[PDB]
Amino acid sequence: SKVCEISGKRPIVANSIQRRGKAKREGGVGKKTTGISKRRQYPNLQKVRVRVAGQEITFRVAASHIPKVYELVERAKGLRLEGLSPKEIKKELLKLL
Template sequence: MARICQITGKRPSKGSIIHRKGQSKKSGGIGTHVTKVTKRKFRPNLQRIRVKLPDGGTKRMLVAVKAIKAGLVEKVV
């Protein structure tokens, strides 16, 4: 099952972790230097919830929390 929101289409995106070493110039050092760059993924916060459909039925879907908070879906209680 892919990590894609079935409402908004949000999916994992690529990025990197940047490691810096040294004391900043503001703190009295000679400045920070990049020592390593590692690849990483930013994954959307997906929840598997039961969603109320427009025709009155229900369905389990993977939905991003941002879509739930925005009111794009109606949860079944």
Template structure:
């Protein structure tokens, strides 16, 4: 399964990591020079959770940002009957 939030649509995005060398001008140097540029990926923090969707409990992949912002409705906790154990 892909690393994609099924509520917000957040997915892996791409970018670059830049390696710089030298002393900044603000510190009295001649400036920073770029030595290397590498591709990298920014991956969202996705978790598999049990969520209430249309009144039913489903296990879906959601991002941590969706959980923090309150988009996720968790199912009610299961209540155990203590009398049935004995």
């Protein structure tokens, strides 16, 4: 329930719309909305732990972008990353986006 670190995907606000009755297309009288409320649609956030230059990097990334992360690791094959802390490596990878 947070932000994708790759796509920036954020929880959104959508409506829950309860309906009763038969649709007009099906020979019915029509759909009567019997209630609307607010609700949140979160991304499908998951954890992705990858090894980069000897350090363990964790990404809280939406599922729909798990492959993108690996692209970063590929694109990280030509960076001076030896010795740096995990946070600095993560900043480098994100800057590669």
